[PDB]
Design a protein around this motif. Structure first.
Motif, PDB file in Angstrom:
ATOM      1  N   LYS A   7     -35.654  15.413  26.000  1.00  0.00           N
ATOM      2  CA  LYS A   7     -34.896  15.887  24.846  1.00  0.00           C
ATOM      3  C   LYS A   7     -33.437  15.459  24.932  1.00  0.00           C
ATOM      4  N   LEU A   8     -32.778  15.476  23.773  1.00  0.00           N
ATOM      5  CA  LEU A   8     -31.323  15.440  23.723  1.00  0.00           C
ATOM      6  C   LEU A   8     -30.767  16.760  24.241  1.00  0.00           C
ATOM      7  N   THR A   9     -29.677  16.682  25.002  1.00  0.00           N
ATOM      8  CA  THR A   9     -29.048  17.875  25.552  1.00  0.00           C
ATOM      9  C   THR A   9     -27.557  17.623  25.724  1.00  0.00           C
ATOM     10  N   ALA A  10     -26.804  18.723  25.830  1.00  0.00           N
ATOM     11  CA  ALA A  10     -25.348  18.639  25.920  1.00  0.00           C
ATOM     12  C   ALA A  10     -24.888  17.884  27.160  1.00  0.00           C
ATOM     13  N   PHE A  57     -29.646   7.732  23.014  1.00  0.00           N
ATOM     14  CA  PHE A  57     -30.875   8.527  23.057  1.00  0.00           C
ATOM     15  C   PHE A  57     -31.965   7.980  22.118  1.00  0.00           C
ATOM     16  N   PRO A  58     -32.588   6.818  22.427  1.00  0.00           N
ATOM     17  CA  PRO A  58     -33.451   6.135  21.438  1.00  0.00           C
ATOM     18  C   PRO A  58     -34.695   6.824  20.883  1.00  0.00           C
ATOM     19  N   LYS A  59     -34.977   8.107  21.176  1.00  0.00           N
ATOM     20  CA  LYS A  59     -36.183   8.775  20.661  1.00  0.00           C
ATOM     21  C   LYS A  59     -36.406   8.537  19.173  1.00  0.00           C
ATOM     22  N   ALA A  60     -35.416   8.893  18.359  1.00  0.00           N
ATOM     23  CA  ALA A  60     -35.695   9.339  17.004  1.00  0.00           C
ATOM     24  C   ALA A  60     -34.815   8.673  15.960  1.00  0.00           C
ATOM     25  N   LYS A  61     -35.275   8.853  14.724  1.00  0.00           N
ATOM     26  CA  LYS A  61     -34.609   8.372  13.525  1.00  0.00           C
ATOM     27  C   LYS A  61     -33.178   8.904  13.467  1.00  0.00           C
ATOM     28  N   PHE A  62     -32.284   8.097  12.883  1.00  0.00           N
ATOM     29  CA  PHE A  62     -30.844   8.380  12.891  1.00  0.00           C
ATOM     30  C   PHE A  62     -30.514   9.755  12.317  1.00  0.00           C
ATOM     31  N   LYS A  63     -31.083  10.063  11.148  1.00  0.00           N
ATOM     32  CA  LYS A  63     -30.887  11.375  10.544  1.00  0.00           C
ATOM     33  C   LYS A  63     -31.271  12.479  11.503  1.00  0.00           C
ATOM     34  N   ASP A  64     -32.404  12.310  12.184  1.00  0.00           N
ATOM     35  CA  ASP A  64     -32.839  13.331  13.122  1.00  0.00           C
ATOM     36  C   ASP A  64     -31.839  13.476  14.256  1.00  0.00           C
ATOM     37  N   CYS A  69     -28.126  17.192  16.560  1.00  0.00           N
ATOM     38  CA  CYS A  69     -26.814  17.465  17.137  1.00  0.00           C
ATOM     39  C   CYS A  69     -26.234  18.776  16.629  1.00  0.00           C
ATOM     40  N   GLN A  70     -26.564  19.150  15.383  1.00  0.00           N
ATOM     41  CA  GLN A  70     -25.988  20.370  14.794  1.00  0.00           C
ATOM     42  C   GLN A  70     -26.294  21.612  15.632  1.00  0.00           C
ATOM     43  N   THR A  71     -27.538  21.734  16.090  1.00  0.00           N
ATOM     44  CA  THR A  71     -27.991  22.944  16.774  1.00  0.00           C
ATOM     45  C   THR A  71     -27.219  23.167  18.072  1.00  0.00           C
ATOM     46  N   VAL A  72     -27.312  22.199  18.987  1.00  0.00           N
ATOM     47  CA  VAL A  72     -26.608  22.285  20.263  1.00  0.00           C
ATOM     48  C   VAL A  72     -25.103  22.352  20.035  1.00  0.00           C
ATOM     49  N   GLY A  73     -24.604  21.657  19.005  1.00  0.00           N
ATOM     50  CA  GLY A  73     -23.180  21.685  18.724  1.00  0.00           C
ATOM     51  C   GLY A  73     -22.681  23.066  18.356  1.00  0.00           C
ATOM     52  N   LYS A  74     -23.491  23.826  17.616  1.00  0.00           N
ATOM     53  CA  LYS A  74     -23.082  25.172  17.233  1.00  0.00           C
ATOM     54  C   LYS A  74     -23.315  26.183  18.354  1.00  0.00           C
TER      55      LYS A  74
ATOM     56  N   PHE B 651     -20.034  17.323  13.836  1.00  0.00           N
ATOM     57  CA  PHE B 651     -20.335  18.723  14.089  1.00  0.00           C
ATOM     58  C   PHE B 651     -19.781  19.630  12.995  1.00  0.00           C
ATOM     59  N   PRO B 652     -20.232  20.885  12.923  1.00  0.00           N
ATOM     60  CA  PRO B 652     -19.569  21.854  12.046  1.00  0.00           C
ATOM     61  C   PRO B 652     -18.134  22.086  12.484  1.00  0.00           C
ATOM     62  N   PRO B 653     -17.267  22.581  11.602  1.00  0.00           N
ATOM     63  CA  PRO B 653     -15.910  22.916  12.036  1.00  0.00           C
ATOM     64  C   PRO B 653     -15.921  24.103  12.983  1.00  0.00           C
ATOM     65  N   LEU B 654     -14.810  24.252  13.692  1.00  0.00           N
ATOM     66  CA  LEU B 654     -14.718  25.096  14.875  1.00  0.00           C
ATOM     67  C   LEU B 654     -13.882  26.327  14.553  1.00  0.00           C
ATOM     68  N   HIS B 655     -14.451  27.508  14.797  1.00  0.00           N
ATOM     69  CA  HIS B 655     -13.944  28.758  14.244  1.00  0.00           C
ATOM     70  C   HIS B 655     -12.987  29.503  15.182  1.00  0.00           C
ATOM     71  N   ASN B 656     -12.445  28.839  16.202  1.00  0.00           N
ATOM     72  CA  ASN B 656     -11.486  29.491  17.088  1.00  0.00           C
ATOM     73  C   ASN B 656     -10.147  29.709  16.382  1.00  0.00           C
ATOM     74  N   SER B 657      -9.493  30.822  16.727  1.00  0.00           N
ATOM     75  CA  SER B 657      -8.244  31.209  16.077  1.00  0.00           C
ATOM     76  C   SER B 657      -7.108  30.228  16.371  1.00  0.00           C
ATOM     77  N   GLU B 658      -6.892  29.877  17.646  1.00  0.00           N
ATOM     78  CA  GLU B 658      -5.639  29.209  18.001  1.00  0.00           C
ATOM     79  C   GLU B 658      -5.634  27.726  17.623  1.00  0.00           C
ATOM     80  N   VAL B 659      -6.763  27.031  17.784  1.00  0.00           N
ATOM     81  CA  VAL B 659      -6.853  25.609  17.419  1.00  0.00           C
ATOM     82  C   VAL B 659      -7.389  25.412  15.999  1.00  0.00           C
ATOM     83  N   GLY B 660      -8.185  26.361  15.498  1.00  0.00           N
ATOM     84  CA  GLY B 660      -8.907  26.143  14.256  1.00  0.00           C
ATOM     85  C   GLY B 660      -8.016  25.989  13.040  1.00  0.00           C
TER      86      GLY B 660
END
Ligand SMILES: [Zn+2]
Lengths: 92, 665, 233, 11
Positions: A7-10, A57-64, A69-74, B651-660
């Motif tokens: 998998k992709l991971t941080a 990370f060559p697994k998957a289609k670009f959109k995927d 990335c959104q999930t791990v990023g959040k 990525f989504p924008p970042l919700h921290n107070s000091e840098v956000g």
DNA sequence: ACACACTCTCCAATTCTCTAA
DNA sequence: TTAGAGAATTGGAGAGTGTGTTTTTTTTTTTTTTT
């Protein structure tokens, strides 16, 4: 057991192969011009991000790749720590 | 047992002959039928077989028996039609009660067999077994009833009504009023029977018109012609329009709502207004076909499929890839796209409505139904006279009913009311947009305060209990009320009504609504968009505004807008005008630029703007290219001022107070 | 102005102009790629003429057409028996006499699919002889497996023909009988030649495997050989 | 039983 | 015995829901 | 408003099972015995 899935991971993103490469090179990679169309310049921006995504990370289609990335990023706190570190560097 | 089952079937079959038969003295080749005896008992016992047995056991087996022995088609229709034609000739001239008794009791069975079908997790396994087959047989019923003597049984059913129209309401007994309910209850079924819906048990992942039935038998077009010749539309018109004068409103006015729903359903109003013609537009469409053919040709190689060489592409850091085919040699855009297209995986995906007949709520309505010229003009005449005559008096009664009865409602009555309101209000607005002979006063009962409260209350209660289908219909009704208000303001009490419509509580609700739309079906999101456009435009012409607009702008609304926009191959020219209006509002006016710097928007503008997607000459490209130019200018400025946004853009924008705070601006 | 699609080219002109002296060798060593490059060059040049000289001709018409180069007079002719396995996929030139021609064979080029449940349709490109059938129906709300199916008579095809060429008596070994080789020919050139004709040709010398049986992927070790003509004189 | 209609069927 | 077509089964990857800070 | 702990639904890995396979002219060139 069967072989565990890959998998992709941080950790990949925070590796030296990962996201630091983009920040080390993006200023030199992309170049807009008023001398070319919107469609022209718009197409140009995606080139670098696509080739980088394949190299990472060559697994998957670009959109995927983006939507994964959104999930791990959040969610991941260590990745978020790295990101606030970037914006602190600009606050420096 | 099987033998008990066939014994009842045989009992029914014998009853299917004790009834009577035509005359073989007649030498009239053929005559009509001729009448049996015990036949009162025959009809009554058949009625008992439905009510006292099949209902009490929840079977539909009895209906299967009567369908086996073809009772409807074979006896009931000629018994009724003979009664009608006999009495017609007698009226031309200008125990008899027993004949009339037979006429009543034949009709009541016609209502029973053609009654529409419902299936739940509480229906019996017997009914669940028999659902698919009885659908076929009811389709046969619809075709037959409309066909006989060009539909003449329908004159019998209204003559029965005419007996009870006859003498003063002050005289009219409860048993008497049931005839006037019964007749209208018949026409509802005849309109409501339509082609089946396929259903299976979800045990494993792997048409229903019978051989005697076809689409032109069953189409709504046919039903128009049939009613017109057999004199129905005059009856529905006279009966609805004098409704206020002391016909007891209680017995008529819900059945009479369901008719108007059941054949407004599946019409787009533009199809009733034109805005060699067929041949001309066909030729133009062939031009569009040629453009699509040209698009395929531009991706087609000159030399054959086995001539092809091989291509290698080298990246930075000297690593190499391999792709095949002759066009890849010259077109890097195609090579890059073809490279990713080989890869196997797709992420698997998530999915809102059930329990009710096909309508605008769960079908794509960019697909008309089709009219003869005589039918087009007759239908236009019927609903135009309905609107000019009946609409206010009907809505006033049915609404001041439901305020006293809201707690007791069922999902269907809610979805009927909200999709009768919507249709007629929109159609009138369109008709007076077109021409000065029409006026808006005809639909003006919708605005008065009680109905406004009721549409509000339906939307409120539906949203809280998370019933998403009523919420969807209520969204459609509440859209039109607002549209009608902006019309009337473009001409006193209406501003009072606005101020009450835009109390803070409702702004909380109407702001909340696009956020949840992201998960659901493509229509739901489209309803959210059109309602939002109207909701903001009214408050723009109120002159509060800055509080309200900031309420709308945040990440989960933008998510919905993009998720909807990327399915543009399916959508109209008009809806994309609405989306870019909103992005103009977010990006230029409000100056909240940071929301749209997110990567899946940047992909989208390439697809849609490419020679792939939006046509080179549609009006859409004017708006899109004028937007993207400005987008990329501001993006250039931002990226050179602060290089961290290269890693920001994923990525989504970042919700921290000091840098956000510095991040967003 | 004559409304025609093919351009002759004798390869010696590539040696006369200084910038193409090496392109001449690359043509002989890599025909499939180089010829494709030449085709897409000619079409672009034709477009450039009408848009630069701003002429009245329909741009859509020129964009719709296919344009093809046909190289010839490539070099010395080669004896039919003296072609060796180091000549595979290079350009060749042959002289001979025509024995017979088979009737025109339809060759598929584009496949046409239709969804059995929702009636969505897709056109698919054929390359390397393999149909790239979709895994699931691509309509968003009808994302179902095994749901698409092929419609034969709405596909698109092209003409193929096979010509049998015999060795001219000038080359036959002492005390022996002449041999023959088979030529595959497509589109424009299909019906050009009759029995008893005497011709010179130019084409890639190809080789392919053949199966042991029609049930399985088992191939034989010997390979079939033939010529893929691009010009006839 | 897990009965289900082909809600998506619209052609 | 050697490639194939088809069936069966288990396990973990995934998303949804509830709770508290 | 984030996040983390627990439950339910689905995918396809991969293991298993059964199966199929080798193998009377009619027209035209040439040699031979027969009247
Ligand atoms: Zn489909």
């Amino acid at each position: 057991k069967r072989r565990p899935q890959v998998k992709l991971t941080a950790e990949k993103l925070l590796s030296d192969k990962g996201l630091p490469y983009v920040l080390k090179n993006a200023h030199k990679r992309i170049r807009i011009s008023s001398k070319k169309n919107s469609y022209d310049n718009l197409s140009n921006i995606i080139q670098f991000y696509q080739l980088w995504a394949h190299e990472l990370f060559p697994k998957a289609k670009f959109k995927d790749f983006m939507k994964i990335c959104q999930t791990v990023g959040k969610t991941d706190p260590v990745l978020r720590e790295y990101r606030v570190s970037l914006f602190r560097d600009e606050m420096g | 047992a099987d033998f008990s089952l066939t014994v009842l079937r045989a009992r029914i079959a014998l009853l299917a002959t004790a009834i009577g038969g035509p005359d073989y003295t007649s030498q009239i080749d053929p005559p009509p039928y001729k009448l049996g005896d015990d036949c009162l008992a025959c009809l009554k016992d058949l009625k008992r077989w439905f009510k006292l047995v099949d209902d009490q056991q929840k079977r539909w087996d009895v209906a299967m028996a009567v369908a086996e022995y073809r009772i409807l088609t074979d006896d009931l229709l000629p018994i009724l039609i003979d009664w009608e034609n006999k009495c017609s000739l007698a009226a031309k001239l200008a125990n008899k009660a027993y004949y009339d008794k037979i006429a009543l009791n034949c009709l009541q069975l016609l209502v029973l067999m053609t009654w529409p079908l419902i299936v739940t997790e509480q229906s019996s396994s017997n009914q669940i077994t028999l659902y698919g087959e009885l659908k076929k047989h009811q389709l046969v019923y619809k075709k037959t009833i409309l066909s006989m003597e060009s539909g003449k049984v329908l004159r019998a059913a209204i003559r029965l009504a005419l007996d009870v129209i006859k003498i003063d309401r002050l005289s009219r007994t409860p048993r008497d009023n049931m005839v006037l309910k019964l007749v209208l209850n018949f026409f509802r079924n005849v309109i409501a029977i339509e082609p089946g819906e396929f259903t299976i048990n979800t045990k494993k992942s792997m048409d229903t018109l019978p051989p005697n039935v076809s689409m032109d038998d069953i189409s709504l077009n046919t039903v128009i012609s049939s009613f017109h010749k057999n004199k129905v539309f005059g009856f529905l018109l006279t009966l609805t329009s004098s409704l206020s004068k002391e016909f007891d409103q209680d017995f008529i006015n819900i059945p009479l709502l369901e008719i108007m729903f059941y054949f407004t359903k599946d019409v787009n109003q533009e199809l009733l207004f034109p805005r060699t013609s067929a041949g001309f537009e066909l030729s133009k469409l062939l031009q569009k076909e040629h453009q699509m053919r040209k698009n395929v040709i531009k991706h087609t190689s000159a030399r054959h499929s086995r001539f092809g060489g091989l291509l290698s592409i080298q990246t930075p850091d000297k690593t190499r890839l391999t792709v095949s085919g002759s066009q890849a040699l010259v077109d890097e855009k195609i090579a890059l796209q073809k490279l990713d297209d080989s890869k196997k995986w797709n992420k698997r995906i998530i999915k809102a409505a059930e329990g009710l007949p096909n309508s605008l709520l769960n079908s794509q309505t960019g697909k008309a139904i089709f009219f003869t010229e005589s039918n087009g003009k007759h239908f236009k005449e019927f609903i135009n006279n309905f609107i000019d005559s009946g609409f206010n008096i009907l809505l006033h009664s049915v609404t001041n009913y439901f305020t006293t009865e809201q707690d007791r409602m069922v999902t269907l009555e809610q979805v009927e009311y909200l999709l009768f309101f919507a249709w007629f209000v929109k159609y009138q607005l369109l008709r007076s947009k077109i021409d000065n002979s029409a006026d808006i006063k005809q639909v003006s009962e919708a605005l008065k305060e009680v109905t406004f409260i009721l549409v509000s209350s339906l939307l409120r209660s539906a949203y809280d209990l998370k019933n998403w289908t009523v919420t969807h219909a209520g969204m459609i009704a509440f859209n039109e009320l607002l549209n009608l208000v902006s019309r009337t303001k473009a001409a006193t009490d209406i501003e009072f009504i606005v101020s009450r419509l835009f109390s803070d509580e409702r702004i909380q609700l109407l702001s909340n609504l696009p956020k949840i739309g992201s998960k659901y079906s493509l229509q739901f999101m489209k309803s959210c968009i059109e309602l939002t456009h109207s909701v903001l435009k009214v408050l723009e012409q109120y002159s509060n505004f800055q509080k309200v607009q900031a309420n709308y702008m945040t990440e989960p609304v933008i998510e919905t807008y993009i998720n909807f926009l990327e399915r543009f191959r399916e959508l109209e020219d008009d809806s994309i005008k609405k989306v870019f209006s909103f992005f103009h509002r977010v990006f230029v006016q409000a100056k909240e630029q940071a929301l749209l710097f997110r990567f899946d928007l940047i992909i989208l503008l390439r697809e849609m703007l490419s020679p792939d997607g939006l046509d080179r000459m549609s009006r859409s490209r004017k708006y899109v290219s004028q937007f993207s130019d400005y987008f990329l200018a501001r993006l250039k400025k931002r990226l050179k001022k602060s290089p961290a946004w290269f890693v920001g853009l994923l990525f989504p924008p970042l919700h921290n107070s000091e840098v956000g705070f510095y991040q967003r601006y | 102005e004559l409304g025609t699609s093919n351009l002759n080219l004798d390869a010696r002109n590539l040696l006369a102009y200084k910038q193409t002296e090496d392109l001449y060798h690359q043509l002989l060593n890599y025909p499939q790629e180089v010829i494709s490059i030449m085709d897409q060059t000619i079409k672009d040049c034709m477009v450039s003429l009408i848009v630069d000289n701003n002429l009245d001709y329909d741009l859509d018409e020129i964009e719709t057409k296919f344009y093809k180069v046909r190289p010839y007079n490539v070099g010395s002719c080669k004896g039919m028996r003296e072609l060796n396995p180091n000549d595979i996929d290079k350009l060749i030139n042959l002289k001979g006499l025509v024995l017979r021609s088979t009737p025109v064979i339809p060759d598929m080029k584009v496949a046409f699919f239709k969804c059995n449940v929702c009636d969505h349709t897709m056109a698919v490109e054929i390359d390397r002889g393999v149909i790239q059938e979709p895994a699931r129906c691509e309509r968003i709300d009808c994302n179902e497996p095994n749901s698409m199916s092929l419609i034969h008579n709405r596909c698109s095809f092209a003409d193929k023909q096979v010509i049998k060429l015999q060795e001219t008596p000038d080359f036959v070994p002492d005390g022996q009988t002449p041999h023959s080789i088979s030529l595959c020919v497509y589109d424009e050139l299909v019906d050009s030649c009759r029995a008893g004709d005497r011709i010179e040709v130019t084409g890639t010398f190809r080789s392919i495997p053949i199966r042991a049986n029609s049930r399985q992927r088992v191939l034989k070790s010997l390979y079939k050989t033939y010529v893929d003509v691009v010009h006839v004189k | 039983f897990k009965s289900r209609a082909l809600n998506h069927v619209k052609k």
